[PDB]
């Protein structure tokens, strides 16, 4: 349902 929703930039910066 929310596939094409906007990006806000709250992505976790993955280390591994």
């Amino acid at each position, epitope marked *: *349902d929310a596939e*094409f929703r*906007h990006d806000s930039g709250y992505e976790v910066h993955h280390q591994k």
Partner: antibody, heavy 119, light 106 residues
Framework: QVQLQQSGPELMKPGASVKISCKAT????????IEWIKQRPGHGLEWIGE????????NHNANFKGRATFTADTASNTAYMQLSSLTSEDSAVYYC????????????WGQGTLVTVSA | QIVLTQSPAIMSASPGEKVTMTCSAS?????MHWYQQKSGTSPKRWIYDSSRLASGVPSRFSGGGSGTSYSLTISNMEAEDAATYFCQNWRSSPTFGAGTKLELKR
């Protein structure tokens, strides 16, 4: 405080088009997305789409097949959802919502608009 | 790609009892949002970013988890806590879980 207020209930004939409004206050209208959520009893909560006011940008749920259009009027701080070719399946409570200040949870919700599609 | 499963669908808790409801993801997710809904009213943001309580949410509520399993916990069940709780994550499809209906046990 951020507030979202929706237009009242709509009684519709099958095949008609409905336009629901969402008046936004307490923040800069052009810097946040107004999002739309469908709720039927026995179906939970479904994301329908969104508009970024003053940008001309909108995003859609593909399962709605272009029947849902999302617009905004920056002069009156009001966002709009239009749903055409209404069926009994479209009978639901429709919410407008917005992200939090420093989080992407839907912190702010409209009171909901009941759409009843009936002959 | 990522499916959310709320177990169980109906949860029964006596007044005073500790309550834990789980939102399981089919693959790892970095956060979980939780929303409270009572009959006839809009969902309210309840717990956001896995553990952060919204303004006005009582201290008996808490949230936690990581990866494929997240939870909402009530330390002592009160009558006003009876509602449906939806878990939610934007990387999930559908984005909202089916909901856990929390009722009073007798």
């Amino acid at each position: 405080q951020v507030q979202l207020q929706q237009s009242g209930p709509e009684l519709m004939k099958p095949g008609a088009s409905v336009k629901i409004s969402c008046k936004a206050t307490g923040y800069t209208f052009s810097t946040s997305w107004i999002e739309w959520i469908k709720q039927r009893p026995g179906h939970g909560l479904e994301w329908i789409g969104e508009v970024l006011p003053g940008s001309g940008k909108s995003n859609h749920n593909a399962n709605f097949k272009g029947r849902a259009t999302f617009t905004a009027d920056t002069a009156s701080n009001t966002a709009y959802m239009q749903l055409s070719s209404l069926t009994s399946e479209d009978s639901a409570v429709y919410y407008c919502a917005r992200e939090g200040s420093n989080n992407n949870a839907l912190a702010y919700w409209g009171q909901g608009t009941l759409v009843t599609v009936s002959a | 790609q990522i499916v959310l499963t709320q177990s169980p669908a109906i949860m029964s808790a006596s007044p005073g009892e500790k309550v834990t409801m789980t939102c399981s993801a089919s693959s790892s997710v970095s956060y979980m949002h939780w929303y409270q809904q009572k009959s006839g009213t809009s969902p309210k943001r309840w717990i956001y970013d896995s553990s952060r309580l919204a303004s006005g949410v009582p201290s008996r509520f808490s949230g936690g988890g990581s990866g494929t399993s997240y939870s909402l916990t009530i330390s002592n069940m009160e009558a006003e806590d009876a509602a449906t709780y939806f878990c939610q994550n934007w990387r999930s499809s559908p984005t909202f879980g089916a909901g856990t209906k929390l009722e009073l046990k007798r």
